[PDB]
Amino acid sequence: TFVALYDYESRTEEDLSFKKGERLQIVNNTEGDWWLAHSLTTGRTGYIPSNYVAPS
């Protein structure tokens, strides 16, 4: 479980957009620095830049 430190606007069809303060769960973080995440806040799923979030 992670919290967004910045807003992030999707740059690909596979990305997850989010706002600062959103809480996210990692679905898969085994493929690189982009993690597949699910927003606990919005219910959406997609890739996020791992340096935009912090553990909670």
């Binding site: 740059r11 982009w34 890739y47 830049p49």
Partner: peptide, 10 residues
Amino acid sequence: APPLPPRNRP
């Protein structure tokens, strides 16, 4: 905001 990481490679 931080620079974005490179996209994942296969």
